[PDB]
Amino acid sequence: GGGRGNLSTTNSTLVAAPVNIEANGSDTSVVTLTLRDSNNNPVTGQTVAFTSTLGTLDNVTEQASGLYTATLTAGTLTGTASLSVNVDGNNLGTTPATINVIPAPVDLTVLTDNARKNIGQAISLTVIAKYKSTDVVAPNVKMTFEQVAVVNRQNSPVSSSGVVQIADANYDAFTGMTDANGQLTVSVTDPNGIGVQTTLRAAAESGDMENTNVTFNVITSPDSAQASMWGNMAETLTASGVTFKRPYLAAEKPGTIGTNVENNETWAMFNQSQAVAMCTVPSSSQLVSLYNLYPLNQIQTVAGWPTMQVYRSSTSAVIGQHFYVYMNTGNYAYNSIGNGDVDGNYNVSCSL
């Protein structure tokens, strides 16, 4: 209230024009103190200083009739700038003016180091923000991420895959800002994915947005344009000089009647005569040796091959029946009662 008590906090006013500026490091507003005593006379020749919670101020200067002005320049942080005033270093308790520092309009670019990887790997996703229609980077822009689409490899929507992770948490928990170069880089993973392409939308606090797709392959689907899901199943496996081919999708062998739906894919299935007409069928001991390399159903959980149904072998058990192998456990058997060789529609891993 001044040393002499003549400065009036009710007759004095502090105002700003405009009261909205963008957090772009360049928008400006004029702060005007009208300094008045208890009789509403102007108080001239005073040493006036302003403070602001956001942005920066230049030096205060005095104009006619006890008006004191300074220019505020926005910073790059959004919020409400609260303005205060002091005279000779003592606070003048006039009502604080405020300025809304609103988000800066930006254009977003979204880059991924590779758009398609395997479950267990991480995709590096970078958002670059520039002030709208310019090449000037926008630092300290608040960013969020949203999953806006999830499809399999045949454009079908998927609602049963896991939540994509950003920085090892659900995408909707992420908060962060662009850095001094206008960039925000995050690590994307899909540990609970089932083989889907996820569209992630980056949104700046201004409401400006941009999309990018990330795909995480599931081991239990083949990397084929005809597969239902996005996958990286082993094409072949080798055990002690014997090479084994993954089973065929039904879509890869349209001429066979047997089918099996397993791990979200439809597989071709064969009786004994169909198998041997198609390729060399490995012996039962060869298949068991492959099991021993990937035991305890790791034929499925490491290499991705479907193991609920047995695999045919070329080893004769009894007249008219050949052993088949459970590639989840390494067990092997035959079936005379059900005539397995003729009526059984089983998996075939070809020997290459």
Domain ranges of the chain: 1-103, 104-233, 234-352
HEC secondary structure over the chain: CCCCCCECCCCCEEEEECCEEECCCCCEEEEEEECEECCCCECCCCCEEEEECCCEECCCEEECCCEEEEEEECCCCCEEEEEEEEECCEECCCCCCEEEEECCCEEEEEEECCCEEEECECEEEEEEEEECCCCCECCCCEEEEEEEEEECCCCCECCCCCCCEECCEEHHHCCEECCCCCEEEEEEECCCCCCCEEEEEEEECCCCEEEEEEEEEECCCCCCCCCCCCECCCCEEEECCEEEECCCEHHHCCCCCEEEEECCEEEEEECHHHHHHHCCCCCHHHHHHHHHHCCCCHHHHCCCCCCCCCEEEEEEEECCEEEEECCCCCCEECCCCCCHHHHCCEECCCEC
Cα separation, 28 vs 22, in Å, equals 9
Residue 314: name the closest of 306, 324, 328 by CA: 324
> What CATH homologous superfamily does 1-103 map to?
Immunoglobulins (2.60.40.10)
Q: Give the method of determination.
A: X-ray
Residue 350: name the closest of 268, 248, 253 by CA: 248
Q: Are 327 and 291 in contact (CB under 8 A)?
A: yes
Cα separation, 156 vs 114, in Å, equals 23
Cα separation, 260 vs 280, in Å, equals 21
Q: Cis peptide before 254, with omega less than 30 degrees from 0? A: no
Extract the tokens encoding 11.
């007759």
Burial label, 247 (beta-carbon count in 10 A; 0-12, 13-18, 19+): buried
Q: How far is CA 154 from the centre of its chain?
A: 21
Extract the tokens encoding 80.
């409400």
CA distances from 349 to 143, 246, 270 (A): 49, 6, 11
What phi and psi, each to the nearest 5 degrees, are found at residue 288? -65, -35
Residue 348: name the closest of 319, 320, 322, 318 by CA: 322
Contacts of 319 (CB under 8 A, 6+ apart): none
Extract the tokens encoding 150.
């999830």
Residue 180: name the closest of 136, 133, 143, 123 by CA: 136
The CA-based angle 260-264-268, given to 5 degrees, is 30
Q: What is the stated resolution of the deposited model, in angstroms?
A: 1.7
